[PDB]
User: Which sequence fits this backbone?
């Protein structure tokens, strides 16, 4: 009779954390990590063994400091994923170095590298999503990766242009953001408080969901980034939702059955011509929130990557 | 002496307006327009004849409403430039439709169309700068246009990535912004008052100027967008400065000689490899001010274009 159980009737619940304790507690279907969560998880004293294993593995691959830093940081992200895969039945999402976000070729190469590490550790591609920021270059990377049997999670998705381009690329899953949209609207408009159905992040995911189902797209819609439980409840029915442990706790502690809020009913429509790069860039840049937040999210994940490299470099 | 006269010892002063009254009063070397200035100038009652000519001309070109709207708006922008060219000895800058800012081929086509209108009116390319927003697509357009003998003014220039890419493309002139940079820093930091030398717009143009001269680039540096005369005076020595009539008046009314503040002295250096598109996108998006203000400036000019089209449409 708790809201977490009630939500699971309608939506596949995913845990947004690198902490295996959350996997044991909430028993989610999938888990998501990102570079900030990898850096946070690396602070868990109990994860020191995973760091040491990554460093030891890196030193067996080469005798070069620069490559050891890359190898150990990549292997740490994979090692955390491997621990999570022992505790969930579904996917792990592991994000590529955000510094590659505007480089399609380098992103494809990094995705293949991470897939190789997982495969060599005995994990098949059907358990992995490689996460890429949904810039044009990331979307193009993902389209190629899918053609080669690597499933992707297209993240930092803010504008309708991003949503459309991801669907047209046939990516496995999108992670459209909710809470960071609320943040932007509180900072940049005169409306400082929002009821759940008014929340602009909730509106964004709801509109994306409608567009996807109305055109028969099979890309999984997974809402991500949450500030409060109200946002999550308003999206009950979303294919998946990835939720941080603090809000999983709030759902589990809240009594009362909930209703499905997000559904599609209608006549499925023909698809348009694919959006071109120029049209995509025009339309993405019409959305000042998305302009700001996509670029910002990439910068922040890049800073976390640099912090991971410093941590690793100090151990070599 | 007065500060305008003194400034002119060091810098070519350009008038930032579509109003011929300013050209008569200040006798500038060049003039700049943009879509906002064209909309404002089109609304001057004494300019109605220029609108009527543009509409009359458009109706000679086709019997199609949609094409007449485009033809009349383009011809109006050129007609205003033609009036200004009677009153200045140097260049007119005329900006392409900002809705084309992420479309290289459409931007090249529009630039060539505007050049044809000027040429057919008896004006040679050596009197014209076609103005383009300095997105990657605009810079690529300009690189091609320059090779075909069309000189360009690369505008809405905020990041170092934009500055470098413009120099490497061999564009005739850049218009790096000053005042809009100050605006962003006031809005996004706790510092709202700056000494002239610490004004972040002044710092931007000064750094761009240094980079250009240090590497022997011949692209003209023309500071643009001003909030106060202190900004202008701190850039005395910039190749050109384009200044609104309100600030030209303030300079003319301010007594006293000023010193040259912006100069290059040093050993000219070898150039790097050209910045790639991916490196450019990464580096531009490292600059949150530039991310916001480039996209914003394009949106605003596109709205002005739409308002112009509404004005013209009502007259067909």
Assistant:
């Amino acid at each position: 009779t708790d809201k977490l159980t009630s939500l699971r009737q309608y939506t596949t619940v995913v845990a947004d954390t690198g902490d295996i304790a959350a996997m044991k507690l909430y028993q989610p279907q999938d888990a998501t990590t990102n570079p900030s969560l990898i850096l946070n998880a690396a602070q868990i004293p109990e994860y020191r063994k995973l760091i040491d294993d990554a460093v030891a593995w890196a030193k067996q691959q080469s005798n070069d400091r620069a490559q050891q830093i890359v190898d150990a940081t990549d292997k740490l992200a994979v090692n955390i994923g491997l621990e999570i895969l022992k505790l969930v039945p579904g996917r792990i999402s592991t994000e590529v170095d955000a510094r590659l976000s505007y480089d399609t070729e380098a992103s494809i190469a990094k995705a293949k590298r991470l897939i190789k590490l997982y495969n060599d550790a005995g994990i098949s591609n059907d358990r992995i999503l490689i996460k890429l920021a949904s810039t044009w270059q990331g979307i193009r990377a993902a389209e190629q990766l899918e053609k080669e049997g690597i499933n992707c999670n297209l993240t930092l998705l803010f504008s309708f242009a991003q949503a459309r381009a991801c669907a047209e690329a046939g990516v496995f899953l999108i992670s459209p953001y909710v809470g960071r949209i609320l943040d932007w609207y509180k900072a940049n408009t005169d409306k400082k408080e929002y009821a759940p159905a008014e929340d602009p992040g909730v509106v964004s995911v709801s509109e994306i969901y409608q567009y996807y189902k109305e055109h028969g797209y099979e890309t999984v819609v997974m809402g991500a980034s949450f500030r409060n439980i109200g946002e999550i409840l308003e999206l009950a029915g979303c294919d998946r939702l990835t939720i941080a442990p603090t809000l999983l706790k709030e759902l589990a502690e809240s009594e009362g059955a909930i209703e499905r809020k997000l559904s599609y009913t209608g006549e499925v429509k023909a698809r348009p011509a694919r959006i071109t790069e120029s049209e995509f860039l025009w339309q993405h840049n019409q959305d000042p929130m998305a302009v700001d937040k996509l670029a910002e999210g990439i910068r922040k994940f890049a800073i976390d990557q640099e912090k991971l490299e410093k941590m690793i470099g100090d151990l070599l």
Remarks:
- Chain A has one domain: 1-316.
- The longest helix of chain A spans residues 288-313.
- Chain A touches chain B through 21 residues (CB under 8 Å).
- The CA atoms of residues 20 and 84 of chain A lie 6 Å apart.
